[PDB]
Amino acid sequence: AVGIGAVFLGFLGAAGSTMGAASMTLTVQARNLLSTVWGIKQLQARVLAVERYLRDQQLLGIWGCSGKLICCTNVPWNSSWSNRNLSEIWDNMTWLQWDKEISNYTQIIYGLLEESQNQQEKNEQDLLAL
Amino acid sequence: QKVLVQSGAEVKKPGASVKVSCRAFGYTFTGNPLHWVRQAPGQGLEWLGWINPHSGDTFTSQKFQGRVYMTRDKSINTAFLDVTRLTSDDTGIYYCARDKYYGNEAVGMDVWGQGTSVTVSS
Amino acid sequence: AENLWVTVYYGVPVWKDAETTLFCASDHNVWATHACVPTDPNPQEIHLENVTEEFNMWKNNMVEQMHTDIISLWDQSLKPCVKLTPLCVTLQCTNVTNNITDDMRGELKNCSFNMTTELRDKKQKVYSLFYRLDVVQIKEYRLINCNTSACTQACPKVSFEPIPIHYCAPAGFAILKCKDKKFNGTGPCPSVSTVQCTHGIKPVVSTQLLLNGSLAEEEVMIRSENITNNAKNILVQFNTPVQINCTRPNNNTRKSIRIGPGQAFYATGDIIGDIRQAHCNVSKATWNETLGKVVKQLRKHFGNNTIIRFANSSGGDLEVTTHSFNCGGEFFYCNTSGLFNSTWISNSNDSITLPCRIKQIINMWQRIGQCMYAPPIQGVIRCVSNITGLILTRDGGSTNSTTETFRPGGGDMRDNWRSELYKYKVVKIEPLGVAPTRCKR
Amino acid sequence: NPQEIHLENVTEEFNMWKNNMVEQMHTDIISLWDQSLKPCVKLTPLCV
Amino acid sequence: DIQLTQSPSFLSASVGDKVTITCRASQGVRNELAWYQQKPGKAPNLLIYYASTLQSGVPSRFSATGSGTHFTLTVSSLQPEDFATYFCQHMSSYPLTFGGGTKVEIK
Ligand SMILES: *[C@@H]1O[C@H](CO)[C@@H](O[C@@H]2O[C@H](CO)[C@@H](O[C@@H]3O[C@H](CO)[C@@H](O)[C@H](O[C@H]4O[C@H](CO)[C@@H](O)[C@H](O)[C@@H]4O[C@H]4O[C@H](CO)[C@@H](O)[C@H](O)[C@@H]4O)[C@@H]3O)[C@H](O)[C@H]2NC(C)=O)[C@H](O)[C@H]1NC(C)=O
Ligand SMILES: *[C@@H]1O[C@H](CO)[C@@H](O[C@@H]2O[C@H](CO)[C@@H](O[C@@H]3O[C@H](CO)[C@@H](O)[C@H](O)[C@@H]3O)[C@H](O)[C@H]2NC(C)=O)[C@H](O)[C@H]1NC(C)=O
Ligand SMILES: *[C@@H]1O[C@H](CO)[C@@H](O[C@@H]2O[C@H](CO)[C@@H](O)[C@H](O)[C@H]2NC(C)=O)[C@H](O)[C@H]1NC(C)=O
Ligand SMILES: *[C@@H]1O[C@H](CO)[C@@H](O[C@@H]2O[C@H](CO)[C@@H](O)[C@H](O)[C@H]2NC(C)=O)[C@H](O)[C@H]1NC(C)=O
Ligand SMILES: *[C@@H]1O[C@H](CO)[C@@H](O[C@@H]2O[C@H](CO)[C@@H](O)[C@H](O)[C@H]2NC(C)=O)[C@H](O)[C@H]1NC(C)=O
Ligand SMILES: *[C@@H]1O[C@H](CO)[C@@H](O[C@@H]2O[C@H](CO)[C@@H](O)[C@H](O)[C@H]2NC(C)=O)[C@H](O)[C@H]1NC(C)=O
Ligand SMILES: *[C@@H]1O[C@H](CO)[C@@H](O[C@@H]2O[C@H](CO)[C@@H](O)[C@H](O)[C@H]2NC(C)=O)[C@H](O)[C@H]1NC(C)=O
Ligand SMILES: *[C@@H]1O[C@H](CO)[C@@H](O[C@@H]2O[C@H](CO)[C@@H](O)[C@H](O)[C@H]2NC(C)=O)[C@H](O)[C@H]1NC(C)=O
Ligand SMILES: *[C@@H]1O[C@H](CO)[C@@H](O)[C@H](O)[C@H]1NC(C)=O
Ligand SMILES: *[C@@H]1O[C@H](CO)[C@@H](O)[C@H](O)[C@H]1NC(C)=O
Ligand SMILES: *[C@@H]1O[C@H](CO)[C@@H](O)[C@H](O)[C@H]1NC(C)=O
Ligand SMILES: *[C@@H]1O[C@H](CO)[C@@H](O)[C@H](O)[C@H]1NC(C)=O
Ligand SMILES: *[C@@H]1O[C@H](CO)[C@@H](O)[C@H](O)[C@H]1NC(C)=O
Ligand SMILES: *[C@@H]1O[C@H](CO)[C@@H](O)[C@H](O)[C@H]1NC(C)=O
Ligand SMILES: *[C@@H]1O[C@H](CO)[C@@H](O)[C@H](O)[C@H]1NC(C)=O
């Protein structure tokens, strides 16, 4: 076939696309997360949005994935969380179904990433001491 | 919901310039490329080319380069085809069609405009 | 032999159902648009392909937020106005009998009373034309609200005309719109889009008839949280609006009485010319065909051979038992008896005239002890509106008979907002995700 | 000890007649005047 | 350019019968083929993309198979409103060209 390059699908246009295609529009969703009865319906909502964004940023940063949108980690994928093979994950399923599937193991994975990052920082400090 | 609407029919003298518009509804204008095709009275479909509304890149058929131009405006979700040096052989219905464009490559034209009839005579 | 590892993705297009505080946007008025964000000249709608979303109009928090906002705006608009505490006095009332029709027998009371002036030590004998619904006999009368709370006069410069309002979500939240035509407000919607905010929704306060609303683009739509439950209000949305022409033809005169320092009470002085009942007109053939469409749509839910009957409201307050609305500052309550009066069996230029009673003392929302006094409007008033829907209630429900009876309903304005926000929901984006990949740090 | 940073080689366009600082000060002064008078006596009886 | 030839140019058949129409390409296209239907004086409509997948909303009676140079469009059961000009179009390389045109006529 013939192509003319990539296209822009919008803020959440890649929601229905597969994970492989949806991972090519991560910045599109990322950059839209920050931006007298009506006037006070704005201040606290803006504060809440700021706190949510900062919670996400801190959570990424304490894993060593700061300033990155795709980040590899040293935590092995315990197969108990999910048994699906990659072939049926990245090419025949969207991210919404993935979030539906793995909703139970989120916090333990987050803690594992946190402790792995702490171990990595300590190991780096030890290595640079020599 | 996916619809394409063009301007009205055009009658022009030979050697003039004609501008055919095409506005999109029901889908993200920058999310798909737009083919420009033409069908002469009682003949087949001739592929003029296609444009990418997002990056603005265009491709014209080798037997049309330097004669037909394509542009878009995203503020109103419209694509313009400018055909210059009109002749009696350019008569027919111009169609603007949305490509399916799965996998960042041409797959098929599924949504078509109502077709703009352009006529050229002395 | 997999050697898979966690991989963190930020910016994932995933969302969850959430409740948040939407803010107003729009292009003197009760609906304070001066505190609303300017609407974008070219709003952007992102059409989501392959996305199917679960919608439920009857549990939408947008309706509750809109209800709270409308009540708050109404309360805010009335704060700087004159409080008519002095108006609670004994009224010497006689019958207005000059140039009155047989349908206005005793509907207007010419009431004289003493009143305070700007000087605390002086009194003025004044008079006003009140409505029979606004006064209660103690020849001695008093305003109806005097034994419940003092009424706040509406500021005359503020207009009651609805203005469209858009409800745009904050950052990190999205508004999903169901584009699926024929959608009945509940279940999976396979045609979904993302919008910064909805279309301009006008906060039209009306009972028994949805006015100046949106129209179904395919056919008449019947919606109910539980259609089999007769206690649930049935929302009917039209596709062809029914033109209704509502008029008060009395040439009212407004006079101003200084009741204190910088405080004016706007009384009805005298009606110039003939006095006759305010009313509304609805095209008879259009109403008949609209009712036929409603019947043929209801037959899908209640059987094909059932008898569909339209009758009067059962009873209750004047607000619910009648089509209550506002027309250019004056509050109409119209007897919708010529509309819902017919039976339907499966098998020119005149119009239906609905008489209407005008009221000045108003309890807009279902709140006891917070009333508003509408100043009289100078001159004849007429307004033309579109009936775009109905709020029906099914009577009975026993299996003994094969007849179904639907009566007009209303009162709770949350249903009015629900008819406009049925195709919208709010979600919060969850950009973080973890996936398996062969990549290793 | 307020600190003033003296900018060298900087030329800036000034316009006293379109300064928003004046409008902000006007609003603040009116608001303060209104606030100071709120917890005071209202002489409504004095109209005799 | 790349030549697309069709067989038959004209065809007479009755409602309920089966129609098979062949597109042949001078050069090789793996699956870069699209089948369209156009009625007299009306905009064309897509029937098949990838030479084997129905367009959304197309009746299931339609079907197509073929890779390389030989492709076939099959209407398993003719329907009254299925009489129109049938087109086959390639997109492997520029320019995109359409078929000659196959017209199905009632018997
Ligand atoms: C459904 O929609 C339709 C169409 O939008 C609505 O019908 C329109 O309703 C509006 C308002 O009710 C009406 O506009 C009025 O028209 C009058 C006749 O032309 C005007 O006289 C009136 O102006 C007065 O009121 C304004 C505020 O309401 C003031 O800003 C203005 O200065 C005028 O006020 C002066 O005059 C009055 C009377 O003498 C006096 O008391 C004041 O002190 C002041 O001196 C409005 O412009 C439209 O004409 C209507 N259009 C049609 C086609 O009918 C309908 O009401 C909607 N239905 C519902 C239920 O919301
Ligand atoms: C919405 O979902 C549909 C499928 O339900 C998506 O269409 C599918 O897109 C994939 C990749 O774009 C197609 O895979 C291709 O298959 C051909 C033929 O086997 C192959 O040659 C290609 O290399 C590629 O693997 C798939 O065929 C296609 N399915 C259908 C029925 O058309 C669509 O892309 C989704 N939309 C969005 C916006 O994500
Ligand atoms: C309402 O009552 C007032 C007073 O009772 C009427 O005003 C009087 O009008 C007559 C003219 O018919 C004058 O001669 C009097 O001097 C007026 N009296 C006052 C105190 O103004 C008024 O006309 C009545 N209005 C209606 C509609 O009945
Ligand atoms: C306004 O006040 C005056 C004075 O209080 C009222 O006139 C009195 O009426 C009573 C009967 O209710 C008489 O017993 C008094 O002798 C009257 N006094 C005077 C000075 O007239 C008058 O009725 C009040 N008006 C209204 C409309 O209530
Ligand atoms: C009553 O309904 C009619 C018909 O829908 C409305 O007229 C339409 O107004 C819109 C303005 O947004 C136009 O775009 C349409 O072309 C009009 N249609 C027709 C058939 O005239 C009318 O505006 C409605 N009136 C009110 C007060 O809601
Ligand atoms: C409502 O309808 C009634 C009649 O059905 C109208 O009454 C007529 O009004 C016109 C004014 O244009 C007069 O010329 C006629 O003499 C009246 N006839 C009758 C029998 O009353 C009334 O005007 C209509 N009102 C509205 C607001 O449409
Ligand atoms: C609906 O129609 C019924 C039937 O006419 C109304 O009942 C009437 O009520 C009035 C009192 O307002 C009585 O004087 C009549 O005798 C009643 N009619 C009969 C036949 O008994 C009922 O009021 C109407 N509903 C509304 C909300 O107006
Ligand atoms: C609403 O209108 C209906 C129809 O006019 C009213 O029913 C009438 O009530 C009067 C009582 O004053 C009877 O004399 C009529 O015979 C009734 N007519 C019919 C057709 O039943 C009804 O009372 C009105 N509702 C209200 C609250 O006034
Ligand atoms: C006023 O008129 C009503 C209705 O006609 C009547 O009931 C009432 O008794 C009248 N009051 C008078 C004449 O004081
Ligand atoms: C006020 O008076 C009316 C009529 O006299 C009566 O129906 C109502 O219950 C009273 N309300 C209170 C709070 O006393
Ligand atoms: C209509 O509402 C019912 C309520 O349960 C739902 O099951 C049905 O799916 C809705 N209609 C459509 C077409 O989805
Ligand atoms: C609807 O109401 C009927 C009658 O009360 C009840 O039997 C039925 O379970 C209700 N349906 C739902 C979905 O709650
Ligand atoms: C109402 O009365 C005023 C004053 O007499 C007059 O100017 C106006 O024209 C009248 N309006 C109507 C509709 O009769
Ligand atoms: C309402 O008024 C409009 C404008 O005068 C008119 O065209 C229409 O026929 C009227 N309808 C009724 C039911 O009176
Ligand atoms: C209701 O309909 C009946 C027809 O059976 C008619 O006799 C009666 O007058 C109607 N009443 C109203 C208020 O329209």
Residue numbers in the entry:
A (entry chain D): 512 to 546, 569 to 663
B (entry chain I): 1 to 52, 52A, 53 to 82, 82A, 82B, 82C, 83 to 100, 100A, ...
C (entry chain C): 31 to 57, 66 to 141, 150 to 184, 189 to 309, 312 to 321, 321A, 322 to 398, 410 to 503
D (entry chain A): 80 to 127
E (entry chain J): 1 to 107
From the paper:
The discovery of the bNAb VRC34.01, isolated from a chronically HIV-1-infected donor, identified the fusion peptide (FP) of the HIV-1 Env gp41 subunit as another specific target for broad immune recognition. A majority of VRC34.01’s total interactive surface area (55%) binds to solvent-exposed FP residues 512–519 at the N-terminus of gp41, while 26% of the surface co-recognizes glycan N88 on gp120. Trimer-bound VRC34.01 prevents Env subunits from entering into a co-receptor engagement conformation that is required for viral entry, leading to 50% neutralization breadth of 208 globally representative HIV-1 isolates. Structural analyses demonstrate that the improved paratope expands the FP binding groove to accommodate diverse FP sequences of different lengths while also recognizing the HIV-1 Env backbone.
Soluble IgG expression and characterization of these multi-mutant variants on the 20-virus panel revealed that 10 of the 28 multi-mutant variants achieved a neutralization breadth of 90% or more in the 20-virus panel, and the most improved multi-mutation variant VRC34.01_mm28, or mm28, used a total of three heavy chain substitutions from the template VRC34.01 to neutralize 100% of the 20 viruses in the panel (VH_E2K_A33P_T59F, or in Kabat numbering: VH_E2K_A33P_T58F). We determined cryo-EM and crystal structures of the improved antibody bound to BG505 DS-SOSIP trimer and to FP8v4 peptide, respectively (AVGTIGAMF). A CryoEM reconstruction of VRC34.01_mm28 bound to BG505-DSSOSIP. The cryoEM structure showed nearly identical binding of VRC34_mm28 and VRC34.01, relying on recognition of both gp120 and g41 to achieve neutralization. B Superposition of VRC34.01 and VRC34.01_mm28 bound to BG505, showing no discernable differences in binding. The K2HC substitution in Combo1 and mm28 converted this residue to a positive charge and became attractive to the negatively charged E87 in gp120, which reduced the energy 0.76 (Combo1) and 1.09 kcal/mol (mm28) compared to the VRC34.01 template, which tightened and stabilized the binding between the antibody and trimer (first column). A33P additionally contributed to affinity improvement between the antibody and trimer; the P33HC substitution in mm28 interacted repulsively with I515FP which allowed room for N52HC to generate hydrogen bonding with the carbonyl group in the backbone of I515FP (third and fourth columns). Structural comparisons of the template VRC34.01 to the top two engineered variants VRC34.01_Combo1 and VRC34.01_mm28 demonstrated that improved antibodies still bound to FP and Env much like the template antibody, relying primarily on heavy chain interactions with both gp120 and gp41 for virus recognition, with improved antibodies binding more surface area at the FP interface.
